[PDB]
A paper describes a structure:
The receptor tyrosine kinase EphA2 interacts with ephrin (Efn) ligands to mediate bi‐directional signals that drive cellular sorting processes during tissue development. The Eph extracellular domain (ECD) consists of four subdomains: the ligand‐binding domain (LBD), the cysteine‐rich domain (CRD) that includes a sushi domain and an epidermal‐growth‐factor (EGF)‐like domain (Arora et al., 2023), the N‐terminal fibronectin‐3 domain (FN1), and the C‐terminal fibronectin‐3 domain (FN2). Efn ligands bind to the LBD and sterically seed clusters of Eph ECDs, which then drive forward signaling through tyrosine autophosphorylation of the Eph intracellular domains (ICDs).
Given the importance of the LBD in clustering EphA2, we solved the structure of Fab C1 bound to the LBD‐CRD fragment to 3 Å resolution, which revealed an ASU containing two C1 Fabs and two LBD‐CRD. In this structure, the LBD‐CRD was observed in two conformations, resulting in two distinct but overlapping paratopes and epitopes for the two Fabs. The first Fab (C11) interacts with both protomers of EphA2 (CRD1 and CRD2) through distinct contact surfaces. The second Fab (C12) interacts exclusively with the second EphA2 protomer (CRD2) at the same epitope observed in the 1:1 complex. Analysis of the symmetrically related molecules revealed a 4:4 Fab‐EphA2 tetramer where both LBD‐CRD1 and LBD‐CRD2 form homodimers with symmetrically related LBD‐CRD protomers through their LL′ interfaces to form a quaternary structure resembling a “bouquet” of four EphA2 ECDs held by four Fab C1 “hands” (top). As the number of protomers necessary for a proximal‐recruitment doubles compared to Efn or IgG L1, agonism by IgG C1 results in approximately half the maximal activation at saturation compared to cross‐linked tetramer clusters.
Numbering used by the authors:
A (entry chain C): 1 to 9, 11 to 35, 40 to 64, 67 to 72, 74 to 110, 125 to 239
B (entry chain G): 1 to 32, 39 to 58, 66 to 72, 74 to 80, 83 to 114, 114A, 115 to 220, 223 to 232
C (entry chain A): 27 to 60, 63 to 68, 70 to 109, 115 to 160, 162 to 329
């Protein structure tokens, strides 16, 4: 059926430039108006740009007028958004969609604008008490501190442990880097026998930390 | 620029209830209104177009109405696959004027009150070798989301050096989970004894703590 | 599509087919070996004339029929005789019934097995032969089919007689009905299509044509109907433009989105109305956006 695929996102230092691509399939893009919509992290939807190749008009939003450029290649069935002179307020996930009543959406691509440096996460154990404190159950985890940019994915025991896990959203520290924690509850009687390894995975630096969390004594 | 004022910001309901979201535009927008659904992680999904027409393939329990400038999205009987955030959008003039969205309306599951399991984690000796100490307080599977988490270092209320994170509602038991992190320098941490976490919720306050000379 | 005129397997030995060696020759037997019925073994009779006629299958509209055979065979040398079983057919006009006149039966190619012969019947072996042939063109209201035995130990399991037809289909916004396939290789059955609802033939274009071949297949569609103004192609039927969309001319294009400064159109719209004040030049098409009135 109809399908839209996006590409082009990543880091860019403040005042930089970046270009985004919206690959379509299943319909002619000449016959349909294409629009770009961004969603700042944790905030609502904001319209960025429109284009209709049939009439050749290009409609922008005020906050991006002059700095962003919409365009479309009729032959490659693809729409684009060229972003120049980017600022931190532009950090968001960017979507593309067909028609003003947007019916088919892309999967979304993340654009980070900051003066930060890509760095793999530092992983620290949230060591569980050696026994008890809370009934029959104990809680252990991983602190994922001082990394940039999002995203980070965590799993426990190579994905084999899924029940009762809780991975939090990252919080943007004053240092400019992201931190997050991941925790899981397990029976305390298992602390001695079963090993617990958290798998932090940060594709933006090709880093994968594996932490064996061991009970503290 | 037209304004869409979505009310409420958030509402909690149970399975089967009839739910109503209103979006009032600052000007007559004719029928150029659409409603969208966005589950966390996924992209938005079109539900209603022309403010009263159901997108083909959307379950019919969704309906859209217009009374002047007052657009309502209505769900006859809320199904579990319907707990998500909903946005109204206006597209009057098809580009003559900028597109604006409602501020959104998150629909959450109503549930019986649950008490947090409060855990506290000292900074790892591995991290302390780097000059920064991160102290973590965990609130596991509670209800509702509202909680007052505070930090007390040797009975002096810490204020400003603390960051918090809340999970999406659990898909199995509909409970929230929360973490509060306290960041201090290595020098500050080593110069204090009692570290404590206070979870005040309604009429109860569980408080977890530790001593650097323990375990 | 295939249309069956006889299936021995479906009847399951209910079909009382007539046999010219009345008894002890061609005879029906039951052998639940799996229940599976089969007609079956007189080799010691040197010059034998064992025949088996089927029921009077009504020809109907068929032109060329196909015979599918499932059968098992003997070695003729394991028991110390031939194996080349012969198929026949009669093109009659009335159901005679007890009239095994072998003089008029026009032998079809001598059916032969492949794969495995008698082997071991049920003890040290438990596979059959699916061989198909066909005859035509048939021009009489009725037709019969026969099987001749000159001394072979055969047991026949599935006899299916079917003919081929071109199925109904919806191509190019036009409806082509089910048409009987032909008989001989050169023949093409040219069939005219009926425009689906809300479809109309373009002024300068051929009416929809489809050609039905002897193998029961449609070939080379010519022309096409078009969804008219206010409608767009959906699957293979015409569907009204969704609200907020218009279709100016009757064409192949999908519904177009409403242009700048126009109010959302109703279902199946031909044009989008100008705004509360915006006007459109009288000469401009309804594909054009609106403009204000200075
Ligand atoms: Cl599990
Ligand atoms: Cl849905
Ligand atoms: Cl969860
Ligand atoms: Cl075809
Ligand atoms: Na931290
Ligand atoms: Na032959
Ligand atoms: Na053969």
């Amino acid at each position: 059926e109809v399908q839209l695929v996006e590409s082009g996102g990543g880091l860019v230092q403040p005042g930089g430039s970046l270009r985004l691509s919206c690959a379509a399939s299943g319909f002619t893009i000449y016959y349909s108006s294409m629009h770009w919509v961004r969603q700042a992290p944790g905030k609502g939807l904001e319209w960025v740009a429109s284009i209709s190749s049939y009439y050749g008009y290009t409609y922008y939003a005020d906050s991006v007028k002059g700095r962003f450029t919409i365009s479309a290649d009729t032959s490659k069935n693809t729409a684009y958004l060229q972003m120049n002179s980017l600022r931190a307020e532009d950090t968001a996930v960017y979507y593309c969609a067909r028609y003003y009543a947007m019916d088919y959406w892309g999967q979304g691509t993340l654009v980070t604008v900051s003066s930060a440096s890509t760095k793999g996460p530092s992983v620290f154990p949230l060591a569980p008490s050696s026994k008890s404190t809370s009934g029959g159950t104990a809680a252990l985890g991983c602190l994922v501190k001082d990394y940039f940019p999002e995203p980070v994915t965590v799993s426990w025991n190579s994905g084999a442990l899924t029940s009762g896990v809780h991975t939090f959203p990252a919080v943007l520290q004053s240092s400019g880097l992201y931190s997050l924690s991941s925790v899981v509850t397990v029976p305390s009687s298992s602390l001695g026998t079963q090993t617990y390894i958290c798998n932090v995975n940060h594709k933006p630096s090709n880093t994968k930390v594996d932490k064996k969390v061991e009970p503290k004594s | 620029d037209i304004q869409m004022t979505q009310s409420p910001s958030s509402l909690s309901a149970s399975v089967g209830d009839r739910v109503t979201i209103t979006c009032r535009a600052s000007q007559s927008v004719s029928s150029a209104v659409a409603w969208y659904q966005q589950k966390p992680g996924k992209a938005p999904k079109l539900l209603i177009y022309s403010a009263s027409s159901l997108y083909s393939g959307v379950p019919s329990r969704f309906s859209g109405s217009r009374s002047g400038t007052d657009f309502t999205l209505t769900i006859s009987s809320l199904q579990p696959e319907d707990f998500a955030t909903y946005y109204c959008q206006q597209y009057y003039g098809y580009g003559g004027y900028p597109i604006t969205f409602g501020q959104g309306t998150k629909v959450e599951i109503k549930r019986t009150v649950a008490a947090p399991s409060v855990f506290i984690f000292p900074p790892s000796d591995e991290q302390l070798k780097s000059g920064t100490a991160s102290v973590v307080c965990l609130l596991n599977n509670f209800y509702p989301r509202e909680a007052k988490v505070s930090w007390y270092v040797d009975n002096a209320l810490q204020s400003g050096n603390s960051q918090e994170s809340v999970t999406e509602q659990d898909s199995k038991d509909s409970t929230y989970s929360l973490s509060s992190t306290l960041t201090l320098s290595k020098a500050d941490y080593e110069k204090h004894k009692v570290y404590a976490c206070e979870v005040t919720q309604g009429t109860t306050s569980v408080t977890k703590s530790f001593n650097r000379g323990e375990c | 599509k295939e249309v069956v005129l006889l299936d021995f397997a479906a009847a399951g030995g209910e079909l009382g087919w007539l046999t010219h060696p009345y008894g002890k020759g061609w005879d029906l037997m039951q052998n639940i070996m799996n229940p599976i019925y089969m007609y079956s073994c007189n080799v010691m009779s040197g010059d034998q004339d064992n025949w088996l006629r089927t029921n009077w299958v009504y020809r109907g509209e068929a032109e060329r029929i196909f015979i599918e055979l499932k059968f098992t065979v003997r070695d003729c040398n394991s028991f110390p005789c031939k194996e080349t079983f012969n198929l026949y057919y009669a093109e009659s006009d009335l159901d005679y019934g007890t009239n095994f006149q072998k003089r008029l039966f026009t032998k079809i190619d001598t059916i032969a097995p492949d794969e495995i012969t008698v082997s071991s019947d049920f003890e040290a072996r438990h596979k059959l032969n699916v061989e198909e042939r066909s005859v035509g063109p048939l021009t009489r209201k009725g037709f019969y089919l026969a099987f001749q035995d000159i001394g072979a130990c055969v047991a026949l399991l599935s006899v299916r007689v079917y003919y081929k037809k071109c199925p109904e289909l919806l191509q190019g916004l036009a409806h082509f009905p089910e048409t009987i396939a032909g008989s001989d290789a050169p023949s093409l059955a040219t069939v005219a299509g009926t425009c689906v609802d809300h479809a109309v033939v373009p002024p300068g274009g051929e009416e929809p044509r489809m050609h039905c071949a002897v193998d029961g297949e449609w070939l080379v569609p010519i022309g096409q109907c078009l969804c008219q103004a206010g409608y767009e192609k959906v699957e293979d039927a015409c569907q009204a433009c969704s609200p907020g969309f218009f279709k100016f001319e009757a064409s192949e294009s999908p519904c177009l989105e409403c242009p700048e400064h126009t109010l959302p159109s109703p279902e199946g719209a031909t044009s989008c109305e100008c705004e509360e004040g915006f006007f459109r030049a009288p000469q401009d098409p309804a594909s054009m956006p609106c403009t204000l009135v200075p």
